[PDB]
Design a protein around this ligand. Structure first.
Ligand code: GSH
Ligand code: GSH
Lengths: 238, 238
């Protein structure tokens, strides 16, 4: 129950203690899952405040004028928002092996792959508006077109992951939307992208991914409530 | 006439010579102007190939599957696309003073300001669809709302530029859309953002900005042709 979200009327939280960083998150948010994957991969000590996105604390707009999660806050009071920005900040500001390559071109390549991926999150949006079997057929084709872009990268690189044989930043940035494909009944969208399908299996074996994976039933529970603007959606299961 | 664009039927260009980097550009493209501002600011030796965006060379899709400018190609044959990615690559891969700060938080701040700016380019799109004085009134209000986000940054920082008292990466990334405000008759959109208006004047004084500024009449010439899918638009004046 420590994971229960803070919503409208909640007290503004106190300062982040020295030695920790804080993430403002939501347990079912794929953008915030990026940040949490990086926190875990790098072994960064942190605390989590979940935000009720359907009933937000007024004070949360002081953390991020956009009112979105994720947001990082450190002990110096610095605030960083936008998931990709938070992930890049964590990789740069904390020790351990880098998730981003040092080489400028290879770093640019990871960013270009993120661009290739970048239509997917909004499509997991087209999904909400799909209301029947005709819409569903069209939706699957939209996903297949984007997945083909990604398949081509793996085809030429012939590597296990998008940045090489070792899992790296770009894999964690795109993973949360693939995690949810099964629950969305879009897992057939990778049947004509065989390397991408194998990549999904390799990702599920990663210790960091595995530790943060949410079950289909749990995400289903969240989605049913979320689609109705339920103030209880973010706290599903608690 | 060396600046004349390459279009459909043109021969694929040869390798980039050692010691130079090549940009695939278009003289009136604000995204490519970002890259060219960085090339100039850092004193990077380069060549330019302008692409006829209304009559593209087929081979250009081998440089960028998206078929957009800008694109960088170096002597090793590496290809980098997306303007922000090209700019970050240049800052990292070439010597001279950095345009991006070394500090991870301050770098993240520049990226967050880019996010605050990020609706503007599409609005210079809403502008195309504005066909009368009513549309124009609505368009100006859209710009004013976004400019207020930027004004707030300057208000708290109380610095000459968005990254400090010295011009830096973020200023060059947002400048090309402000350059064009006069020609679009949107220069009144900054009259209630006084620090932003002063920033525009400071930018025009910058040696790099000044060297690459295009006159209103020239951009007007381009726009008139561009709005009709003219194969001659990109080569206006040549
Ligand atoms: N571009 C943002 C998107 C973040 C985002 O959209 N987060 C959602 C939850 S997964 C949110 O906070 N939604 C609340 C809202 O839209 O009001 C990022 O990359 O961090
Ligand atoms: N997101 C790209 C946008 C680049 C872009 O849109 N460039 C335009 C010209 S300013 C282009 O190439 N247009 C050709 C087209 O749309 O087909 C970037 O940041 O580089």
């Amino acid at each position: 129950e420590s994971a229960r979200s803070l919503g409208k009327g909640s007290a503004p939280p106190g300062p982040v203690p020295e030695g920790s960083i804080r993430i403002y998150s939501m347990r079912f948010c794929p953008f915030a899952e990026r940040t949490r994957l990086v926190l875990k991969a790098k072994g960064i000590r942190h605390e989590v405040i979940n935000i009720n996105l359907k009933n937000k604390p007024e004070w949360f707009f002081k953390k991020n004028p956009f009112g979105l999660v994720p947001v990082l806050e450190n002990s110096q009071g610095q605030l960083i928002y936008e998931s990709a920005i938070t992930c890049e900040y964590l990789d740069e500001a904390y020790p351990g092996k880098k998730l981003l390559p040092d080489d400028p071109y290879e770093k640019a390549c990871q960013k270009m792959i993120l661009e290739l991926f970048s239509k997917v999150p909004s499509l997991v949006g087209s999904f909400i508006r799909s209301q029947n079997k005709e819409d569903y057929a069209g939706l699957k084709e939209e996903f297949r077109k984007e997945f083909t872009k990604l398949e081509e990268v793996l085809t030429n690189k012939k590597t296990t992951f998008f940045g090489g044989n070792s899992i790296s930043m770009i894999d964690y940035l795109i993973w949360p939307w693939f995690e949810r494909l099964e629950a969305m009944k879009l897992n057939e969208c990778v049947d004509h992208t065989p390397k991408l399908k194998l990549w999904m299996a390799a990702m599920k074996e990663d210790p960091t991914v595995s530790a943060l994976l949410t079950s289909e039933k749990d995400w289903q529970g969240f989605l049913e409530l979320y689609l109705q603007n339920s103030p209880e959606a973010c706290d599903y299961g608690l």
